[PDB]
Structures are given as C-alpha cells and as structure tokens.
Design a binder for these strands. Structure first.
Ligand SMILES: [Zn+2]
Ligand SMILES: [Zn+2]
Ligand SMILES: [Zn+2]
Lengths: 107, 148
RNA sequence: GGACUCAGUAAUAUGCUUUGGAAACGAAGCUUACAAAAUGGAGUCC
C-alpha cells in the first residue's frame, strides 16, 4: 500500500501527441476541450485517430466521452478493452492488474 | 427520465435489474440478428455487485455450451452499462486470461452506445456490448462493432 | 439460480478553479489512465 507506481507506457514521440490519458480527477468539459484540440492537431501529426485511454475509476467517464463524440459530433470510434500492469510497494515491488479501455476517436 | 436512440423509455437508471433486461430485450437485438445465421448466443449481463470468480466460471460454461454435433458456433454476449462497466471489464479480461493459457484463441467484438438521461441536461450513460467466440468468423451482423 | 449492501473530489456535463477589468471582455489551467472492488474484491437475503 505504501506507494503505487503508474503504468509503463511504451509510446513513440508521434504517439505522445496523439494519445490522451483520462484521470479520475479530470472534469468532463476539460476532457472534451482537450480531445477537440487533439483532433485538430492530429492532422499535422499524420494519424487518423486520437487515442483516449482510461482505467479503473475513470472507465465510465472515459466511455461517456466516447459517447459524446460518436453521437453529438458524428465521429467513427473503435473501442478496445485493456489490461494494465501496475507496480505497488507494501514492504518489495509487487505486480497488480487493473482493467481499462482504449478509445480511438477518428477525425 | 431515460432515453435510448433519441426515444424516451420506461427505465430507472438506478435499477440494474431493469436496465440490463432492456439491454437484452431491445438494445442487443437492435445490433445483432441471430435468426438468419448459424450462431448460438448466450447472454451475460453484469452489475457492479457481481462476483468475479463465479462470473468467470459461468462464462467458461457458457462458451462450451452449444452442441458440438450440429456445427454451431458458440457466442457469448457480455454486456453492461454505466457504473457497472468496470466489473464487466475485470470479469471479461480475467476470462480471456484463463482462456489463452491453454494455447487457445478468443475473438471479441465491442460496441459502445449510451443512455441519455435528462436548461435541459443531457448526460451520456455508456453501454458496452462485447461478443466473444472461439470461432474467428461469426455469422452475426456486427459491422458497427470493433474487432479485438 | 434470483434480489441486493459496501468505494463519499466527473465534488462543478463547454462547465470549473485561480486571475485581470468599473464594465465590455480577457488570462492561466483543470492528461502523461486505477477505487487494496484483479492473488479470479468484500459481504447480505431467498
Ligand atoms: Zn515505478
Ligand atoms: Zn514532442
Ligand atoms: Zn512534439
């Protein structure tokens, strides 16, 4: 319990500018605004989609955002179910698995 | 009240019992026709209160339930909404984990849709529908879905 | 096999906090994804 490390993210430089990570703390509109900006900027980066990632507590809200873009903004979205390995210490580093979602929003 | 596909529905979001039934009886058919094809659909709705161990057990039974003699492809439909999607994901992901270890292959299809609960408020309560099979090609009409 | 209880920061659904201005209207920010509910969470009722 003493501390919990974040997830390993094997991302390239081009992925870093195309991927958003949703926190439990993230407010709804803050996330909307951020995704919008990524949609416009993804043209320059040369990718079809903006990847939106969320896990645990954030899952519902992450998907609620995917519902907004798919319906109210007529975007074509793919939805993936994910398992994420996370390291904890309770002393010794122990592995722990949490379930999440990859949500690709196409331009 | 609650709205699906722009249409008002007699639902109480707080009731998983009520909402899961609506999903099964209305939403899932609205996406997949089992009548014209060679598929055998097993339904599995999930709430936040569901035990993971018991639910993975059930999915193992459901995936090996259709008759081997009639040449039917075994398809399980795992579905949930809103605050219950988290537990679904856990059950789903662990089930696949215990499936690929035998050097077997699972195939899945995911669809995301929503309820609209209602100056006028308009909140999206998400809906996750997952199809799982040991057959790579499913005869179901699930074009809107996502292959995984 | 059915029906449920348990996590108080999405505390704020184009909002919100801080900030400038008398006001008009501005500024900054609210991503590096989790809730001992994934050693296959913990319990109750029929
Ligand atoms: Zn670390
Ligand atoms: Zn860069
Ligand atoms: Zn750059």
């Amino acid at each position: 319990r003493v501390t919990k490390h974040p997830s390993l993210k094997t991302l390239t430089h081009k992925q870093i500018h195309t991927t958003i990570f949703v926190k439990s703390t993230t407010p709804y509109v803050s996330a909307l605004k951020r995704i919008n900006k990524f949609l416009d900027s993804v043209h320059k980066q040369g990718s079809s989609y903006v990847a939106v990632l969320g896990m645990g507590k954030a899952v519902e809200k992450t998907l609620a955002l995917g519902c907004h873009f798919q319906d109210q903004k007529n975007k074509k979205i793919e939805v993936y179910t994910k398992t994420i390995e996370v390291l904890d210490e309770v002393i010794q580093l122990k592995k722990r698995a949490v379930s999440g979602v990859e949500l690709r929003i196409y331009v | 009240g609650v709205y699906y596909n722009e249409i008002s529905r007699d639902l109480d979001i707080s009731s998983s019992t009520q909402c899961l039934r609506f999903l099964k009886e209305t939403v899932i058919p609205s996406l997949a026709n089992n009548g014209n094809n060679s598929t055998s659909i097993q339904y599995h709705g999930i709430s936040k209160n569901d035990n993971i161990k018991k639910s993975v057990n059930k999915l193992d039974k459901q995936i090996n339930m259709a008759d081997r003699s009639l040449g039917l492809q075994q398809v399980v439909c795992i579905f949930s909404y809103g605050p219950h999607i988290q537990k679904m994901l856990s059950i789903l992901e662990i089930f696949k984990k215990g499936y690929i270890k035998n050097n077997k292959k699972i195939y899945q299809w995911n669809k995301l849709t929503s309820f609209d609960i209602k100056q006028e408020e308009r909140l999206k309560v998400p809906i996750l529908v997952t199809m799982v099979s040991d057959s790579e090609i499913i005869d179901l009409n699930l074009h809107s879905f996502t292959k995984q």
